[PDB]
Amino acid sequence: IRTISKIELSKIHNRYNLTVDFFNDLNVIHGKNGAGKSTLIHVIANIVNGDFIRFAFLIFEEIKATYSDGLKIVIRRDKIDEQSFISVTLSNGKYIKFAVGEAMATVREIMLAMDIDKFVKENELQKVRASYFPAFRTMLEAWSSSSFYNRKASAFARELFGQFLPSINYPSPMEIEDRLREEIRRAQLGIAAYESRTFSESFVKVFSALFDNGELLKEIEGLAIAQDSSIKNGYYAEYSKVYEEIRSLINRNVENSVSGALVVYRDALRDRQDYQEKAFSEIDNYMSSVNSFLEDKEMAYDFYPKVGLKFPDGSWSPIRVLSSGERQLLTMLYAASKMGDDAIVLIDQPEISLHIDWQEDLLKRMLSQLSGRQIIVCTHSPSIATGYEDFMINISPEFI
Amino acid sequence: IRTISKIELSKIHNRYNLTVDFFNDLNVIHGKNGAGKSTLIHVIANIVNGDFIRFAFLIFEEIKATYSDGLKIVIRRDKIDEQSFISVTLSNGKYIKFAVGEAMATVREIESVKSMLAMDIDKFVKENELQKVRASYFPAFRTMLEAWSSSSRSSFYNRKASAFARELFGQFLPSINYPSPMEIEDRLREEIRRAQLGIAAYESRTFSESFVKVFSATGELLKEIEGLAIAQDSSIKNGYYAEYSKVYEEIRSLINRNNSVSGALVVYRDALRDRQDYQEKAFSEIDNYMSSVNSFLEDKEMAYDFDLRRKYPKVGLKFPDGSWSPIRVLSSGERQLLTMLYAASKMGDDAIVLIDQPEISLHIDWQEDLLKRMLSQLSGRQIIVCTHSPSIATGYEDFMINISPEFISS
Amino acid sequence: IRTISKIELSKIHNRYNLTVDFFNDLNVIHGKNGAGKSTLIHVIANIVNGDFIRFAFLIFEEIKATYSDGLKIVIRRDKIDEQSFISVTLSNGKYIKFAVGEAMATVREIESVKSMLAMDIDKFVKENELQKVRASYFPAFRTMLEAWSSSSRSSFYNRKASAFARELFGQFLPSINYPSPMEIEDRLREEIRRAQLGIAAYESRTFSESFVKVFSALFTGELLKEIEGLAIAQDSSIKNGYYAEYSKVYEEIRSLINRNNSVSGALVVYRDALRDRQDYQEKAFSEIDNYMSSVNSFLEDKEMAYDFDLRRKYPKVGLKFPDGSWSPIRVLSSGERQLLTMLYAASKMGDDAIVLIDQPEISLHIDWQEDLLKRMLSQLSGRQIIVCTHSPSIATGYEDFMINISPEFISS
Amino acid sequence: IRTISKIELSKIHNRYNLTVDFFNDLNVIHGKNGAGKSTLIHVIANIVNGDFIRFAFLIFEEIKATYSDGLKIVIRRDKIDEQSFISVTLSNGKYIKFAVGEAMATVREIESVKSMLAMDIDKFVKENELQKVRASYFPAFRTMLEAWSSSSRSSFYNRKASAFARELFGQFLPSINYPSPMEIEDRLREEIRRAQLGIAAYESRTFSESFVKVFSATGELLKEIEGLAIAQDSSIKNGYYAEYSKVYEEIRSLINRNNSVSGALVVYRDALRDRQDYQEKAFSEIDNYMSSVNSFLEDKEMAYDFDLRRKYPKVGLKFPDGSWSPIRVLSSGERQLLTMLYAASKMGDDAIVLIDQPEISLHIDWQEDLLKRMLSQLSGRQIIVCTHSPSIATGYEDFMINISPEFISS
Amino acid sequence: SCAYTIDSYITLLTMSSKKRLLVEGRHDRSHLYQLIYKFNPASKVKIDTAQDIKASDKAMSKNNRLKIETIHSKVKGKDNISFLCDRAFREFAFNDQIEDLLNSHYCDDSLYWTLGHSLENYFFNPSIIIDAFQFLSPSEYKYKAIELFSELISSSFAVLAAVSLAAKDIDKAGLPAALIDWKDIVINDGTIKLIRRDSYDIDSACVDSFFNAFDAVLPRVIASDVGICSRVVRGHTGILLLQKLFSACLYYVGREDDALQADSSANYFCNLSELSLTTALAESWVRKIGVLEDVYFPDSLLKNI
Numbered sequence A: 001i002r003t004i005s006k007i008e009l010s011k012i013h014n015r016y017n018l019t020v021d022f023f024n025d026l027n028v029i030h031g032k033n034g035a036g037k038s039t040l041i042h043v044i045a046n047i048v049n050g051d052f053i054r055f056a057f058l059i060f061e062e063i064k065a066t067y068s069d070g071l072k073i074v075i076r077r078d079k080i081d082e083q084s085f086i087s088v089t090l091s092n093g094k095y096i097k098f099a100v101g102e103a104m105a106t107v108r109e110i111m112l113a114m115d116i117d118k119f120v121k122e123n124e125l126q127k128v129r130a131s132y133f134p135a136f137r138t139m140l141e142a143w144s145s146s147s148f149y150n151r152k153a154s155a156f157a158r159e160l161f162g163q164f165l166p167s168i169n170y171p172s173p174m175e176i177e178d179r180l181r182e183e184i185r186r187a188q189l190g191i192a193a194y195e196s197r198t199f200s201e202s203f204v205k206v207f208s209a210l211f212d213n214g215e216l217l218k219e220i221e222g223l224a225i226a227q228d229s230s231i232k233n234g235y236y237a238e239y240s241k242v243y244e245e246i247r248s249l250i251n252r253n254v255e256n257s258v259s260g261a262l263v264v265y266r267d268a269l270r271d272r273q274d275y276q277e278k279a280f281s282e283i284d285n286y287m288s289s290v291n292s293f294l295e296d297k298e299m300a301y302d303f304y305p306k307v308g309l310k311f312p313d314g315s316w317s318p319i320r321v322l323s324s325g326e327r328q329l330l331t332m333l334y335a336a337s338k339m340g341d342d343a344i345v346l347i348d349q350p351e352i353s354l355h356i357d358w359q360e361d362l363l364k365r366m367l368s369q370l371s372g373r374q375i376i377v378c379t380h381s382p383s384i385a386t387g388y389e390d391f392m393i394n395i396s397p398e399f400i
Numbered sequence B, D: 001i002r003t004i005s006k007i008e009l010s011k012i013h014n015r016y017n018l019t020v021d022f023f024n025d026l027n028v029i030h031g032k033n034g035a036g037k038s039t040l041i042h043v044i045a046n047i048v049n050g051d052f053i054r055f056a057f058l059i060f061e062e063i064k065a066t067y068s069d070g071l072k073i074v075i076r077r078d079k080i081d082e083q084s085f086i087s088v089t090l091s092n093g094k095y096i097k098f099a100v101g102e103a104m105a106t107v108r109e110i111e112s113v114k115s116m117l118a119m120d121i122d123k124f125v126k127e128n129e130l131q132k133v134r135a136s137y138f139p140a141f142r143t144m145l146e147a148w149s150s151s152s153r154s155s156f157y158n159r160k161a162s163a164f165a166r167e168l169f170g171q172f173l174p175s176i177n178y179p180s181p182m183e184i185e186d187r188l189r190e191e192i193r194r195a196q197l198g199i200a201a202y203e204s205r206t207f208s209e210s211f212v213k214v215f216s217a218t219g220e221l222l223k224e225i226e227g228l229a230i231a232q233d234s235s236i237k238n239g240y241y242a243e244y245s246k247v248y249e250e251i252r253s254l255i256n257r258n259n260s261v262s263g264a265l266v267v268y269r270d271a272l273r274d275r276q277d278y279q280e281k282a283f284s285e286i287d288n289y290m291s292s293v294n295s296f297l298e299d300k301e302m303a304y305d306f307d308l309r310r311k312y313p314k315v316g317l318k319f320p321d322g323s324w325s326p327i328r329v330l331s332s333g334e335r336q337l338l339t340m341l342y343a344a345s346k347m348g349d350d351a352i353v354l355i356d357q358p359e360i361s362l363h364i365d366w367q368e369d370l371l372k373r374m375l376s377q378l379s380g381r382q383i384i385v386c387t388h389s390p391s392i393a394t395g396y397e398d399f400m401i402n403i404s405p406e407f408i409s410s
Numbered sequence C: 001i002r003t004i005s006k007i008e009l010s011k012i013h014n015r016y017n018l019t020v021d022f023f024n025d026l027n028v029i030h031g032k033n034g035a036g037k038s039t040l041i042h043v044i045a046n047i048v049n050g051d052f053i054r055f056a057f058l059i060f061e062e063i064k065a066t067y068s069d070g071l072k073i074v075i076r077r078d079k080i081d082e083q084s085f086i087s088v089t090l091s092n093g094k095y096i097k098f099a100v101g102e103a104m105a106t107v108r109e110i111e112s113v114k115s116m117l118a119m120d121i122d123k124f125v126k127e128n129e130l131q132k133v134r135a136s137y138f139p140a141f142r143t144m145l146e147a148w149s150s151s152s153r154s155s156f157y158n159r160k161a162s163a164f165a166r167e168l169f170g171q172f173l174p175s176i177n178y179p180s181p182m183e184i185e186d187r188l189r190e191e192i193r194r195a196q197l198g199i200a201a202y203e204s205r206t207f208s209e210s211f212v213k214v215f216s217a218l219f220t221g222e223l224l225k226e227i228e229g230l231a232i233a234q235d236s237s238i239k240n241g242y243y244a245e246y247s248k249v250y251e252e253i254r255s256l257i258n259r260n261n262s263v264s265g266a267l268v269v270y271r272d273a274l275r276d277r278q279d280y281q282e283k284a285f286s287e288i289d290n291y292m293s294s295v296n297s298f299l300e301d302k303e304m305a306y307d308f309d310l311r312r313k314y315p316k317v318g319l320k321f322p323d324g325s326w327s328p329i330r331v332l333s334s335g336e337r338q339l340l341t342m343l344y345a346a347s348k349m350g351d352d353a354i355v356l357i358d359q360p361e362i363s364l365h366i367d368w369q370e371d372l373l374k375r376m377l378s379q380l381s382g383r384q385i386i387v388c389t390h391s392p393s394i395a396t397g398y399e400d401f402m403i404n405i406s407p408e409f410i411s412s
Numbered sequence E: 001s002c003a004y005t006i007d008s009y010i011t012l013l014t015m016s017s018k019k020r021l022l023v024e025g026r027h028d029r030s031h032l033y034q035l036i037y038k039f040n041p042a043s044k045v046k047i048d049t050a051q052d053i054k055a056s057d058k059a060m061s062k063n064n065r066l067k068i069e070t071i072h073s074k075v076k077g078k079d080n081i082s083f084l085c086d087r088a089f090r091e092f093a094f095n096d097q098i099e100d101l102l103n104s105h106y107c108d109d110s111l112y113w114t115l116g117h118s119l120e121n122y123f124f125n126p127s128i129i130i131d132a133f134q135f136l137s138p139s140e141y142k143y144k145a146i147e148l149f150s151e152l153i154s155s156s157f158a159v160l161a162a163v164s165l166a167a168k169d170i171d172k173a174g175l176p177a178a179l180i181d182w183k184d185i186v187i188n189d190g191t192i193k194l195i196r197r198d199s200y201d202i203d204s205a206c207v208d209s210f211f212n213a214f215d216a217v218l219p220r221v222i223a224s225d226v227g228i229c230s231r232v233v234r235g236h237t238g239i240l241l242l243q244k245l246f247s248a249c250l251y252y253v254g255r256e257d258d259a260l261q262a263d264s265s266a267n268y269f270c271n272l273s274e275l276s277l278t279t280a281l282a283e284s285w286v287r288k289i290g291v292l293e294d295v296y297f298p299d300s301l302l303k304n305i
């Protein structure tokens, strides 16, 4: 796919220059205080999201962005007739110049934005998005809980920290809970469609077995025990009754058609169990990644779908009772999941409110989900970057 | 269940008295303009819904209410030392009393979390169980109210709409309990999802039962199986799986190349019959509601469709040209017919359908069939309608009740 | 003074208990995620500030707080006839008891002038002297909170920020008492003005006493060099911005001496007067220079300093750059502002308090975390610092003061 | 400094013309009711303050302003193609021109971020240096304005008060530039702090310079030294140290128990005299202002008090019974006298004192002494006062200017 | 850089509840991760590297072993951490014959030493070297090269040990890495003889001193036991020396069919990255544990954690 491979900044904030060269899988940016980590994350997020109207609010000279396939974007801030103009020039030669004052007026009001998105959609600059995790995730989550959440939180955070700040679009825990409920509903409907298919399929399988001339009962017993004690079946979890009826009628009565029907029944049971496991594959993988971190609780679902936290006494609690660090762990593990949106994960200070035993495994459990996405983190903690010191990038800007 | 049967009013606005007896099934009310039918509707709604705090906003002396189970409620307005009080006394001897000014201060505090008086009223109606039956209230201005809601509501979340309505029409006005089309759409989607889940559970149970019955053990049977497969393939409800005819053809091809096979054939036919009957059993309420709704619509029909590509069953308007549209593109009269039919449907909650001027934005064809289609759903709800047109009340002249106020010289 | 010594919790949120024993100087509190560190800090800050009406918003059974002098406060939440009640019982038998619904109604009325319950709570905490020591509370969310405050607060007038933070994070959260950098700048200006006035009073007293001693005692090679060194050191100080003419007076006195016993006494009392003025300048500016030396140990390309000019009459306090430019203390970054506030709270200039910091490693580089606790403890204020951290770079070198938290889950 | 000399108006509100020349020291204006003196005050305030965007709210033809240094400014309103324009042309040839409707759009944008026209006006008044001297505008309703402010303002932040005054009395009304009594109190505290720091610097300088008088070095001097010690110990300014009497007694005892001694006595007397004279010089402005204020106060006096426990000095009313009261206990007339005397004080900045009806809630004895006390301070500012009371303008009949509006036929 | 100091890491040990292992380099971390994950693929042991710990002392800055000893001394008695270092030439006797004074893994309060010179000496079992070279080969004449190599590997360890000992006598440990090239090696009847090439980029004095030390140490290495001999070879030296010895034997036995193809294959093998060789050897070493009794591993260290 398309990944950021180089970012150059010239006279940004009229203060410094900085050229960063990236990897395609993991980048651990680190540096001293005021080295420009957060501004680098903002530049990357604004370029990748295609939100070039943010660059009217940044004082700079030239910003060059190189992707993996060779696409290059050059953004310049020129001064003519005591007016600043932002010029975006691609590698294709197609360019767009817009005035700073018009962009500022449209921002304060919220035509030019339509031209910008026409230019972006013409050249496919929004092929891959970026999930932006700010350094102020906790108070923003607490404020917004008291894409519309993205819009309101982006407006509030841009009011607080300036208008260059990108659109906050990381998955909030409420969004995580809602999308988990939707995926559980979709998995239940897929199981229903599979049962409706396999009913008519197993009928002609039985009819094929009836026209041709021991441990199977134990295997059917094991499959029925596994399926009856499965949380994914909220309806008709009584295969033990029909298994007992089948074994009682067998022990009361050898036809080869009975053995063929037992083979068909065992195959139907194991195939329904296999489809039931593969329908809940993403949800179980995500909750297994989360539950490898949580100590005295366990994120789980139960049957209307219920998604919450089981405690060792068996009581349930919502996700809202979680800590700040545990909620941040949930969001950062969801952004790297396969059910999360495929993007470029940009996290600013991922070590916030995380114990060092979680910092040492955060990047490992994010890269072990085989998402294939590019992760760029900016950290102050040596425990985030442990085990992955080959991917550490140290930024030392040249101050002027 | 519990139905209202008699309402006695004394000195409403200190000028007229009214005493109307009611039936348990249908109560058609007819009269002249300004007879006090709307005030009687507000009194009945505040009595049935248990919102007694509205009764501090009425200039009256005594209100008597009688239910079907023998519960009688007497509401008395007193004025002692210039301070006005409301006392509500039940039939068993339980009663409460409060102040008019205290209730007005509570309402003004709500305008500017329940207070102590509202919690006292809630505790009194909870420990005596005075809200067994609710009442869906249809105001005469609901065409403006739905436009106000769409330019800015449900049966449970209607506080701002009720506040706006009570701002426009005084604080005696009851809560807006008639549902929104979005609530109807969400209820339809939830009913469809629950029907699909029950169909899947019954399919698993039927497959297990047929497999138990089929082991350890003709042309007309195949014809009936073919007819069942044709009927199930040509049904809207089987959008997730519509390949029964291929199953029938494979069964017939397996049979044709070569008793005990007849038992498997009849249990397979009985399983197909059980699935066909269970689908109609699950979708009976939705099909009855859509049959009542589509009996009025001409160039469109309300229908559901579930594609296997998506997992969200889409319910809405369908044109003969094949277009799919949401329910918000309906006009005022079609939306009124939809809401009044859902209020009389079995899908809605058990309440008393109180309608003021049902002939709002309706053609004269729909007026002669609205009450017939509401009563044909057989939901058993008690319906009280106040109309000025005979086209509403045609064919139901025995339920027509006239209101004659009793003027007193003062 | 009075410091906390033991906090015992019983069934917080009906699921876990905790018992923490504290030290009187520094308490580095660490634990796993979700252990109950921030809740413990909120409990301590509510108890020490005497804001017991917060405890109607927490589900618990019993919270015991022991101080260093032996005063024990026991807060118990009971449910009598479905009505919940908070009872605060001291060790001298004095007690109060109120309703949770009454406290919620009082807080809602404050949201929309003290009520009867607030006046009774304040009377109970004032007649028992429960509010001797304050509690500076540094929240974990302070970095966005001060940005919100500057986009629209002090240790004493922080009602809007505390109300907003309680709106976001629930009503049990304590008041935001940590000093803003504006409060730090105002306190630095007031301390500089007080030190200048004390220096002037010392100058008047020393002038009168020195004239009396000269006139009474009236009826040398090393002395002139020592007085020369003292006058050179006096002219080479920032504190002498209003007068830097000591060397000229020394040269005039030396020229009067050199053209021609009794003069030795005048020379030694002149040396003693210069020594006394220099030592009083060191003493009167001791706390300000100690705090600014702690802050300037962190800043790289700038230093916080004060300047006196004769043309104006306002002592300028702010950042100073090596190229001579001057900038105020609001041009600091977020991490440097965190260092400024967390070092002023542990200084002698701050109020007598217990410094409760939640996540002190927020927006700090790993080089500043290794020196933060050392520079807080090196000012010798005599405070009690309680920090809740996840960072081993904050807690390094202080493993004798580290407190582990492990709550005990109780089944239900 | 720069003072106004000549004001010529053409067709103010298309009804009257006015041409009044002004003195550089005092401008007493007398006339009948509705003569237009307040309009002239607003015109002069908008001319001097550089707030020319108020001139879009005035219907005029040509306004000529001539200062003392030769600065002539011509403001012309034109109506071309129904669009009204304001052109401001200086005596050096520099000019600007802007639309009236664009100015009103900028004003409405300010009512509902600086616009381009406001920045252009700022550039025009910055590159031409038209705002060297400010102008203090005293409205006739300033007591009601400060009562409204206190029941809910400064010379640098008065935007809410300016918006309220422009809403009440038209948008032509200029910015409220008269100082509040709270601003007077804050400026008094600031000047007391400046005087204390200057006294500290002089104390350090005298401590260093006393030894150069000692190294350079009877009964008649002891009496003067005792009197100086009594004067220093009985002074407000020496609250931090008032122990000179013990020093005098020890010096006298050491003299009596057993040349250069007379030299030491005379340099100590000179040092104490210089210390007292420097303290009097440092507090001279505040003492002159308080002497001007206390001439009107009967049973109290505005005074400053130091302290040794706290270092924050207190400015307020001291009674002969010993009570201390703040400045908010003063009445309306005392507050008006305080603001007018601070307007004529040397502590305030160089501006033009524009007062309309200074005699608001003033006793007739205070009116005869107000202008005497204002001119006794010798501030040298230009004062334009519009009054109807002859007790204000007695003794200064040479500076009394009558306003004669020249009515035009239309 | 962004890394812990000695004190910060000790505080981390106090705060962290994991089972930890401290090793010198990142390559040791990768190899030990494979070793641990073979026995327990779900193991939760965290392995830290002393290479990523800052030291204030200039001398201790690049001395990983001194960092480990300092940390171990200051937390001596902890239960959740174990330490592993490289034995180097410690506890070996050079009294005219190579003698191992331990013949087992060293243990001193959770501080362990590798059985060989370093961790890579565990790869020096002949079956592991064979399997690894066979898997990572040009795949042209692999079978005959492997057959010849299995004959040469028995006596080649004496040569490798002599090279390492000659390197440590003149303290130029990294000298044979760039000095000796695969073309200098000659394949004899089971032996090899690194001819002293006339042309070298380095000065002749160093080359002459190296061969003087090699000649003076070779008979002593010959008289020693082969098993003891295979453990004293320097870890970094041995990998490259085996890479060249295999490039030489491959070209020696493959030149007759096609000289150019054999030369290209030999140069391709010689240009292989060290990390590739170590990873292939590590995978082979992991697979051979438990199958052959002649493959060793730090069993005590694994048991302790």
Ligand SMILES: Nc1ncnc2c1ncn2[C@@H]1O[C@H](COP(=O)(O)OP(=O)(O)OP(=O)(O)O)[C@@H](O)[C@H]1O
Pocket (backbone or CB within 6 Å): A013, A015, A032, A033, A034, A035, A036, A037, A038, A039, A040, C333, C334, C335, C363, C364
């Ligand atoms: N308007 C501005 N916006 C942002 N940074 C600015 C601005 N003006 C100057 N700067 C400087 O530019 C640099 C950019 O730093 P940045 O805001 O990215 O913080 P950082 O490197 O993430 O640091 P940290 O989070 O550790 O405080 C800083 O030195 C900052 O002081």
Ligand SMILES: Nc1ncnc2c1ncn2[C@@H]1O[C@H](COP(=O)(O)OP(=O)(O)OP(=O)(O)O)[C@@H](O)[C@H]1O
Pocket (backbone or CB within 6 Å): A317, A321, A322, A323, A324, A325, A326, A353, C013, C031, C032, C033, C034, C035, C036, C037, C038, C039
């Ligand atoms: N309302 C609640 N009901 C039940 N449990 C709660 C509730 N609120 C919080 N908790 C749990 O109790 C603890 C509360 O304290 P808290 O989250 O602040 O601890 P912490 O160790 O400081 O957290 P952090 O992970 O942010 O460092 C957490 O374990 C949290 O999951």
Ligand SMILES: [Mg+2]
Pocket (backbone or CB within 6 Å): A037, A038, A039, A135
């Ligand atoms: Mg940052």
